[PDB]
């Protein structure tokens, strides 16, 4: 489906999973940040790509990118 | 398991829901209450855990987000596959995703510049 | 005091100056024609 | 009930009660020699309808409305604060105010002595004085 | 019921006016963006987006009520002034036919004096279509002095309301308890406003009718008209003009009501002298409405214990398909200021349309039916007013599920069901819309095909006899035989549009038995199509505003939001306010087709002239007996022949209605800039201009940004409507003046 | 294309326009005061045609003109109706620019764009001789900018 790629601009303020609808991203301990959190998206098969994390993403250029890819039932958000 | 009663049809008896994977949530519900479904009107919440059927994943997570704002209750959502495969996709760590956990890993993570360079040096 | 601050707002100043510019032109087309001399 | 609104209300009462008295003492003064004497031939030439739309008095009223503007543009800020404008009449009045308070024990609030009664009497009397003489041609019923 | 007042809550100070955006701390600390400039005005009237204290929201809307009320009074006080300083109402009072209406003059500045239409009566100006002269003649106003006294009396009432909306607020303030008295509110709106209002005006047109009826209809000069007080000061004058006034409220107590039959009648139809309804039937009408409202204004609990109440009335209505029906609706309307506004906008919006229909059907004012420009203008005027109002009803009935609906507090299982089987309501309306579209407009495609194809339209004539004069024909025949039979006390029909072959003419045709035919079944179903689609999209915005299948967490985003993003294939324009934005557009199409239908069909078969050598010759003689069935006739004989009255007017005084006609297409196509492009490209467009602004540092501190995604669509519909009304506003005011 | 004082096809339009206006003029009584102003309006009409005749005007009666720079027609373009637009517009523009220079300082930038002290608006009259002084200050604008612009990346 969609391709989630995390920039190196992360501050770890958990804005992803707070905004994110179906919890695509996930906070993971990391050793190269101020707060110490990093966003990671294992369940990219279930990602829909609604692009609501780029709104809550603080950085000048956003830190969580999701490039538009293929479309499946998991990424169309349809109930049928 | 005792589940809230809802009238109005719409949600049930859909062929697509039967042939497609379905979602099953639950909540503690220590007290009798009254809530609203993300796709229905109003319904009374009974004591103990309550199992429902959901056809979308966003429908399965918005209800948990709405429950967390009411009272403080741990949520459990289980995501079933087409045949009969039942896997715990929600809270596989059992730790809340925004909060920090010990079980850490990285999936699909490129550590390059910000303007672009879409090639990934290593997938794992 | 504060009435002058409300008088100093963007819409009030804009309408006041535009009233001046419009009235000058209404009086211009009513009074002398442009003489224009080669 | 509020402060700043009742301020302009009581002020407008004072700002017109003196106007509603100098006009009465002006309209009566100009007609003191022609009140009666055969009812001044129904006000004679003083009838407003008989005037020539104020040809000669219009350019004079414009000058009056101009000077009266800045007169009240002095009354608007002189009321603001006590100092300068109102403070000098302040201690002037305080010279009769001290004697008046001595006659009236602790303070004798002058506003109860006659600030509201004069203010409202002038307004009501001038409102009726402008209708009986300027707002009735055919009486139909006798006016008593 | 208790006098609970919170005297002095907000002080009178210019401090808030000094701060641009004092109503919201979010719109005050950060005015660094151009978008903030538009947000300051977009949320300026969204009072529920500031503070949540209902005691203050009720003390911010009743203020806006008195403010808007003062604006309306300032507006009305000028109408009596314009019909006295520069107008022709007195000359028109003496000569009503030859003197065209006018109450607006221009000045010699840039040669614009060509707009001074030669109307007559020794005064030139701009023709008016507001019905002011008909209303003033029906009010007994003759002299110019009676205009100025009413205007100077309007200034007083206009000032008192400003000093009232500034009284119950900066000076006084009732508590929150004063607003849950909805029971005490309907007892004063249906009896104090509707009741005493229908009685006060009733008592007027009984003593002011004879200066119009038994005088101006006889043939007396306006100078020979006696004074209205001379009729009251001498009861015998009223007694001679009406031989029932000699009694003077004596059989009123004796219940000998028949002795008041000289002013109180139920004739029906129109009067063959004035040109409108009877001047005696309306007086009896308002008397009948007044007593009915004096009875209907006593229905709810005051502070004596008797009567019903909106509470238990709705707590008692049940129903099998409703379940816990009607209960909780009291808590629905008594808690949300919004909630009352949709049912008000809905009822009052349909009311403006219904009263617009009642205007042309039975003309209530004298010399109104012959005044074709005024009649045509007033109908479509209230028509579009109600269109906006009903869409506002949808705009706020969508607000309710988002802003004030809870799954614990306010509860009606009826509204619950409207949201529980919500997918069924719109499914029904959807199939109804499609059936009424693929046929009503399908038959348009069909007939337009039959003509260009050849002999198919010839064989369609038998079907043209079908549908038309098949239905609704018997309804008119019922109304023909309704007087005498089912109306023994009525010597005329409801209107002469019902009485067959009965034509009333006063040198110009007033009303006609509107013989349906050819394509009235066509346009009425084009209407029903554009009505069901409008109701569908607005009701969709109503009940889908809370629970949506696509996005479950809908209540978090809001009402006037853009969308969610490119996910799920594409979530775009899913807000209920957008169902209103597009609901404004289908209402636009509905009202556009209805005003087209009414306007043109009138001069097609109703409006015309009369000669003695013949009978009836219309302005456009019976054209839409064929030119209405196909789409081509709607721009071959309708939209085409109208350019000869809007453009061929530069040599006359109707040149402004051509400039506005051609200039309204400009602003309409200017709406095609916002309704098609996107903020992304335009935001990339500013930063280049901002680069030029950073080259000379002429960049403003307020950072240049594009319009909001929602504000662009709000301005887009604003121009699509303004540019989509001013054209027909210039068109309805084009031909009707040339063919008047 | 001949001038209209010699173009016989232009004076005919004056006669024809007054002829169309005369039918509207004669239906009302000239002795009435509300229509005595029509004679003053046609006086304005008459006083308008004579000045345009001096300008070269179309033979058709549609009065054309010159923008090539011909010194005989500088009145229709170059000198009056053109240069004043440039000066008056830029007297506003460079005055706005001077206000943009004083748009910073301590008091908030938003306060100094919108809620400005009226005194700056009263100082606007400063720009009597913009040209070269404005050129100096615009040089300084480009200079102190030091090519500080947006990324465009
Ligand atoms: C050379 C200066 C001058 C002169 C001689 C006039 C003269 C006149 N003006 Mg005018 N006016 C002026 C400057 C001037 N104005 C300026 C600078 C403005 C603002 C830009 C206006 C705006 C204005 C308006 C809006 C109107 C007039 C009007 C009038 C006429 C009568 C009403 C009046 O203004 O009474 C005295 C002036 C004051 C009390 C002030 C009158 C012949 C009225 C008119 O007849 O319309 C054409 C009218 O409506 N003027
Ligand atoms: C909203 C009501 C309204 C509207 C639309 C108009 C419109 C108009 N008035 Mg008017 N007027 C009004 C109320 C109104 N008036 C009231 C309540 C009074 C006091 C009784 C007057 C007294 C008055 C006088 C004495 C004169 C006019 C004149 C005029 C015309 C000249 C335009 C102008 O200068 O005003 C400005 C127009 C606007 C600012 C736009 C309309 C405002 C709405 C709210 C927007 C114009 C068509 C002049 C005229 O026609 O010459 C004979 C004239 O001399 N008016
Ligand atoms: C700025 C110019 C201007 C102004 C101030 C007015 C003002 C007025 N016109 Mg008018 N009109 C105009 C231009 C103008 N008109 C033009 C160019 C035409 C085409 C020739 C007309 C044609 C026209 C007709 C046919 C009629 C009027 C009427 C009226 C009066 C009714 C009040 C009203 O409509 O409120 C304003 C209405 C609004 C919708 C504006 C409010 C919305 C926001 C503020 C914009 C009013 C005093 C009526 C009347 O009876 O005259 C006394 C009437 O029937 N007008
Ligand atoms: C059953 C209600 C009803 C009906 C059928 C009428 C009908 C009529 N009214 Mg009326 N009116 C009513 C209630 C009603 N009114 C009330 C309650 C008031 C007090 C506010 C008024 C105050 C009023 C005034 C001041 C005037 C009229 C006038 C008129 C006549 C022309 C106006 C019009 O067509 O709009 C009709 C309005 C409606 C159809 C809406 C009423 C529907 C209710 C809610 C049911 C018309 C025959 C005019 C007139 O007398 O003609 C010369 C006039 O000037 N009415
Ligand atoms: C001439 C252009 C045009 C045409 C032919 C249509 C045709 C149609 N529209 Mg549409 N619409 C248009 C312009 C047009 N629209 C524009 C410009 C807008 C923007 C405001 C919309 C917004 C719109 C909405 C929001 C909806 C429609 C719907 C419909 C369908 C109604 C079902 C029906 O009766 O089928 C009849 C077939 C023919 C008449 C042919 C129909 C096919 C409704 C729908 O989908 O069905 C319920 C629907 O909800 N339209
Ligand atoms: C019993 C006294 C009475 C009288 C004398 C009138 C007289 C009139 N009414 Mg009326 N009406 C009345 C009672 C009365 N009404 C009552 C009790 C109601 C219900 C509240 C209405 C509701 C009503 C409406 C909705 C309308 C009128 C209208 C009219 C006018 C149209 C002329 C006509 O066809 O006759 C009578 C009119 C009828 C509709 C038939 C009688 C009323 C009901 C339906 C029977 C007319 C002057 C029309 C109007 O306002 O003109 C623009 C209009 O549309 N009336
Ligand atoms: C910068 C490019 C540009 C320009 C200059 C115009 C200019 C114009 N367009 Mg246009 N348009 C454009 C781009 C442009 N358009 C694009 C890209 C599209 C989409 C393809 C459209 C689609 C479009 C449509 C659908 C229509 C226009 C129309 C018009 C005319 C409106 C008439 C008018 O009021 O003028 C000024 C005339 C006056 C009398 C001024 C009124 C003065 C008042 C009274 C004050 C006008 C001359 C309308 C038209 O006239 O049809 C030909 C029309 O309906 N345009
Ligand atoms: C570039 C050519 C052009 C364009 C793009 C338009 C576009 C439009 N015209 Mg127009 N028209 C044109 C040429 C054009 N016209 C010409 C040459 C004439 C003859 C002079 C007319 C005479 C005309 C009239 C009389 C009317 C329109 C109307 C309309 C609008 C229809 C409103 C609507 O869609 O609701 C739905 C309409 C239907 C479903 C039918 C629309 C925006 C109507 C309007 O603007 O209403 C405000 C209207 O009344 N036009
Ligand atoms: C047709 C519209 C119009 C007209 C006739 C004028 C006319 C004029 N403007 Mg002006 N201006 C306009 C629109 C217009 N402006 C607009 C839309 C803006 C932007 C809001 C400005 C902003 C502006 C500024 C900043 C200044 C002028 C100034 C001037 C005057 C220059 C001569 C002088 O007094 O020094 C002049 C009379 C100058 C002026 O008079 O200073 C007060 C001045 O500096 N204008
Ligand atoms: C033009 C355009 C813009 C930009 C719109 C802008 C910049 C609005 C400009 C309006 C203002 C009022 C013009 C600037 C005038 C200043 C206020 C100065 C006025 C000072 C005096 C004249 C009073 C969008 O943001 C947009 C968004 C989505 C789809 C299409 C579009 C679109 O087409
Ligand atoms: S959006 Fe970016 S900066 Fe914010 S918490 Fe997620 S990874 Fe960190
Ligand atoms: S791509 Fe969409 S669903 Fe996935 S994390 Fe980002 S906002 Fe959430």
UniProtKB/Swiss-Prot annotation, chain A:
Cofactor note (record): Binds 2 [4Fe-4S] clusters. Cluster 2 is most probably the spectroscopically characterized electron acceptor FA and cluster 1 is most probably FB.
Q: Using the record's annotation, list all stretches that form the 4Fe-4S ferredoxin-type domain.
A: 1-30, 38-67
Example GO biological process = photosynthetic electron transport in photosystem I
Summarize where [4Fe-4S] cluster 2 binds, as residue positions: 20, 47, 50, 53
Q: Which reaction does it catalyse?
A: reduced [plastocyanin] + hnu + oxidized [2Fe-2S]-[ferredoxin] = oxidized [plastocyanin] + reduced [2Fe-2S]-[ferredoxin]
Cofactor(s) needed: [4Fe-4S] cluster
Where along the chain is [4Fe-4S] cluster 1 bound? 10, 13, 16, 57
* HAMAP family, alphabetized: PSI_PsaC
- In Swiss-Prot or TrEMBL terms, this protein is called Photosystem I iron-sulfur center
Q: What organism is the protein native to?
A: Cyanidioschyzon merolae (strain NIES-3377 / 10D) (Unicellular red alga)
Q: Show the taxonomic lineage.
A: Eukaryota, Rhodophyta, Bangiophyceae, Cyanidiales, Cyanidiaceae
* Gene that encodes it: psaC
Swiss-Prot record, chain C:
* Claim: Transmembrane helix is one of the keywords in the record: yes
Q: Where in the cell is it found?
A: Plastid, Chloroplast thylakoid membrane
Gene Ontology biological process terms from the UniProt entry:
photosynthesis
SUPFAM superfamilies, per database record: Subunit IX of photosystem I reaction centre, PsaJ
Per the similarity annotation, which family is this? Belongs to the PsaJ family.
Please give the InterPro entries that the UniProt record associates with this protein: PSI_PsaJ, PSI_PsaJ_sf
Q: Which PANTHER family match?
A: PHOTOSYSTEM I REACTION CENTER SUBUNIT IX (PTHR36082:SF2), PTHR36082
Report the superkingdom from the record: Eukaryota
Q: Which gene is annotated as encoding this protein in its UniProt record? A: psaJ
TM segment ranges:
6-26
How the protein sits in the membrane? Single-pass membrane protein
GO-annotated cellular components: chloroplast thylakoid membrane; photosystem I
**This protein is called what?**
Photosystem I reaction center subunit IX
Function, as annotated: May help in the organization of the PsaE and PsaF subunits.
Where mainly located?
plastid
Species per Swiss-Prot/TrEMBL record: Cyanidioschyzon merolae (strain NIES-3377 / 10D)
List keywords of the entry alphabetically: Chloroplast, Membrane, Photosynthesis, Photosystem I, Plastid, Thylakoid, Transmembrane, Transmembrane helix
Curated annotation (Swiss-Prot), chain E:
Q: Which residues bind phylloquinone?
A: 682
Q: By its UniProt entry, which Gene3D superfamilies does this protein fall under?
A: Photosystem I PsaA/PsaB
Q: Where does [4Fe-4S] cluster bind?
A: 563, 572
Residues given in the record as chlorophyll a binding sites:
673, 681
Q: Name one GO cellular component term.
A: chloroplast thylakoid membrane
Query: What InterPro entries would the database entry show?
Result: PSI_PsaA, PSI_PsaA/B, PSI_PsaA/B_CS, PSI_PsaA/B_sf
Similarity comment text for this entry: Belongs to the PsaA/PsaB family.
What is this protein's record name? Photosystem I P700 chlorophyll a apoprotein A1
């Amino acid at each position: 489906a969609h391709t989630v790629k995390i920039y190196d601009n992360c501050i770890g303020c958990t804005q992803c999973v707070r905004a994110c609808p179906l919890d695509v991203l996930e906070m993971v301990p990391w050793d190269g940040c101020k707060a110490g959190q990093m966003a990671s998206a294992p369940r990219t098969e279930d990602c829909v790509g609604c692009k609501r994390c780029e709104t809550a993403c603080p950085t000048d250029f956003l830190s969580i990118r999701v490039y538009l890819g293929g479309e499946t039932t998991r990424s169309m958000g349809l109930a049928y | 398991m005792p589940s809230p009663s809802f009238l109005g049809s719409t949600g049930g008896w859909l062929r697509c829901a039967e042939t497609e994977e379905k979602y099953a949530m639950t909540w503690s519900s220590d007290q009798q209450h009254i809530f609203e479904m993300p796709t229905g009107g109003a319904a009374v919440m009974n004591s103990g855990d309550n199992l429902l059927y959901l056809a979308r994943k966003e429908q399965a997570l918005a209800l948990a987000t709405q429950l967390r704002t009411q009272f403080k209750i741990q949520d459990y959502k289980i995501y079933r596959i087409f045949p009969s495969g039942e896997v715990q996709y929600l809270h596989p760590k059992d730790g809340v995703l925004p909060y920090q956990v010990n079980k850490g890993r990285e999936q699909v993570g490129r550590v390059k510049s910000t303007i672009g360079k879409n090639v990934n040096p290593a997938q794992v | 005091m504060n009435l002058k601050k409300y008088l100093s707002t963007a819409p009030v100043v804009a309408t006041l100056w535009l009233f001046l510019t419009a009235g000058i032109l209404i009086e211009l087309n009513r009074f002398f024609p442009d003489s224009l001399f080669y | 009930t509020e402060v700043f609104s009742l301020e302009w209300l009581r002020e407008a009462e004072i700002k017109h009660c003196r106007v509603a008295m100098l006009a009465v003492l002006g309209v009566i003064a100009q007609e003191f020699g022609t009140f009666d004497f055969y009812n001044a031939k129904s006000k004679l030439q003083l009838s407003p309808d008989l005037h020539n739309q104020f040809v000669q008095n219009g350019a004079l009223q414009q000058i009056l409305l101009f000077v009266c503007a800045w007169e009240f543009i002095v009354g608007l800020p002189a009321l603001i604060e006590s100092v300068n404008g109102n403070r000098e009449p302040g201690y002037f009045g305080f010279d009769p105010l001290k004697l008046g308070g001595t006659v009236g024990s602790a303070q004798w609030k002058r506003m109860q002595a006659g600030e509201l009664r004069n203010g409202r009497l002038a307004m009501i009397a001038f409102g009726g004085f402008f209708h009986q003489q300027l707002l009735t041609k055919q009486g139909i019923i006798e006016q008593l | 019921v208790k006098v609970v007042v919170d005297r002095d809550v907000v002080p009178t100070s210019f401090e808030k006016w000094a701060k641009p955006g004092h109503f919201s701390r979010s719109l005050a600390k950060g005015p660094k963006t151009t978008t903030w400039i538009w947000n300051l005005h977009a949320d300026a009237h969204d009072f529920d987006s500031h503070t949540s204290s209902l005691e203050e929201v009720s003390r911010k809307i009743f203020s806006a009520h008195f403010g808007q009320l003062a604006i309306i009074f300032i507006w009305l006080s000028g109408m009596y002034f314009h019909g006295a300083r520069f107008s022709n109402y007195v000359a028109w009072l003496s000569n009503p036919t030859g003197i065209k209406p006018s109450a607006q003059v221009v000045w010699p500045i840039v040669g614009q004096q060509i707009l001074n239409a030669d109307v007559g009566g020794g005064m030139q100006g701009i023709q008016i279509t507001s019905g002011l002269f008909q209303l003033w003649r029906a009010s007994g106003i003759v002299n110019e002095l009676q205009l100025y006294v009413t205007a100077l009396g309007g200034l007083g009432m206009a000032g008192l309301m400003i000093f009232a909306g500034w009284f119950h607020y900066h000076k006084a303030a009732p508590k929150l308890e004063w607003f849950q008295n909805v029971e005490s509110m309907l007892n004063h709106h249906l009896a104090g406003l509707l009741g005493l209002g229908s009685l006060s005006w009733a008592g007027h047109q009984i003593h002011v009718s004879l200066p119009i009826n038994k005088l101006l209809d006889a043939g007396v000069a306006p100078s020979s008209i006696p004074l209205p007080h001379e009729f009251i000061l001498n009861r015998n004058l009223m007694a001679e003009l009406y031989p029932s006034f000699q009694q003077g409220l004596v059989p009123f107590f004796t219940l000998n009501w028949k002795q008041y039959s000289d002013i109180l009648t139920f004739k029906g139809g129109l009067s063959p002298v004035t040109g409108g309804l009877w001047l005696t039937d309306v007086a009896h009408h308002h008397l009948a409405i007044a007593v009915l409202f004096l009875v209907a204004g006593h229905m709810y609990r005051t502070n004596w214990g008797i009567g019903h109440s909106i509470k238990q009335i709705l707590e008692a209505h049940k129903g099998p398909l409703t379940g816990e029906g009607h209960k909780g609706l009291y808590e629905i309307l008594t808690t949300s200021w919004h909630a009352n506004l949709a049912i008000n906008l809905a009822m009052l919006g349909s009311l403006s349309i219904i009263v617009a229909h009642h205007m042309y059907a039975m003309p209530p004012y004298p010399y109104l039916a012959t005044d074709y420009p005024t009649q045509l203008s007033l109908f479509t005027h209230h028509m579009w007013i109600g269109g906006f109002c009903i869409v506002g009803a949808g705009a706020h009935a969508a607000i309710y599920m988002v802003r004030d609906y809870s799954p614990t507090v306010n509860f009606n299982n009826v509204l619950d069901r409207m949201i529980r089987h919500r997918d069924a309501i719109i499914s029904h309306l959807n199939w109804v819309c499609i059936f009424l579209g693929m046929h009503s407009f399908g038959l348009y495609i069909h007939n337009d095909t039959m003509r260009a194809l050849g002999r198919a339209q010839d064989m369609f004539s038998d079907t043209a006899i079908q549908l038309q004069p098949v239905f609704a024909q018997w309804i008119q025949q019922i109304h023909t035989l309704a007087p005498g039979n089912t109306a023994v006390n009525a010597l005329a029909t409801a209107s002469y549009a019902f009485g067959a072959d009965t034509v009333t003419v006063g040198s110009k045709i007033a009303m006609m038995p509107i013989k349906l035919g050819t394509a009235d079944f066509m346009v009425h179903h084009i209407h029903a199509f554009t009505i069901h689609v409008t109701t569908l999209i607005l009701l969709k915005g109503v009940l889908y505003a809370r629970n949506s299948r696509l996005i479950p967490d809908k209540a978090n985003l809001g009402f006037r939001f853009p969308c969610d993003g490119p996910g799920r294939g594409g979530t775009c324009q899913v807000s209920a306010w957008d169902h209103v934005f597009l609901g404004l557009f289908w209402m636009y199409n509905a009202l556009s087709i209805v005003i087209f239908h009414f306007s043109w069909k009138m001069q097609s078969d109703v409006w015309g002239t009369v000669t003695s050598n013949g009978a009836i010759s219309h302005i456009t003689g019976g054209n839409f007996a064929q030119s209405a069935i196909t789409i081509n006739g709607w721009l071959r004989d309708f939209l085409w022949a109208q350019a000869s009255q809007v453009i061929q007017s530069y040599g006359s005084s109707l040149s402004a209605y051509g400039l506005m006609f051609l200039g309204a297409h400009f602003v309409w196509a200017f709406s095609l800039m916002f309704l098609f492009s996107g903020r992304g490209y335009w935001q990339e467009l500013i930063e280049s201009i901002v680069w030029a602004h950073n080259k000379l540092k002429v960049a403003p501190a307020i950072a240049p940004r594009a319009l909001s995604i929602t504000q662009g669509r709000a301005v887009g519909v604003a121009h699509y409507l303004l540019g989509g009304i001013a054209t027909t506003w210039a068109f309805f005011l084009a031909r009707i003046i040339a063919v008047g | 294309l001949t001038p209209c004082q010699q173009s016989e096809a232009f004076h005919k339009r004056e006669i024809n326009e007054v002829r169309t206006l005369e039918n509207r003029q004669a239906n009302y009584e000239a002795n009435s005061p509300s229509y005595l102003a029509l004679q003053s309006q046609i006086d304005q009409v008459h006083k308008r045609f004579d000045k345009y005749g001096t300008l070269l005007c179309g033979q058709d009666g549609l009065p054309h003109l010159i923008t090539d720079g011909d010194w005989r027609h500088a009145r229709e373009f170059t000198i009056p109706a053109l240069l004043f637009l440039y000066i008056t517009g830029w007297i506003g523009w460079v005055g706005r620019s001077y206000l943009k220079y004083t748009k910073e300082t301590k008091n908030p930038t938003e306060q100094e764009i919108i809620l400005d002290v009226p005194m700056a608006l009263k100082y606007m009259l400063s720009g009597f001789l913009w040209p070269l002084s404005a050129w100096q200050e615009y040089r300084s604008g480009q200079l102190l900018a030091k090519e500080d612009e947006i990324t465009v990346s």
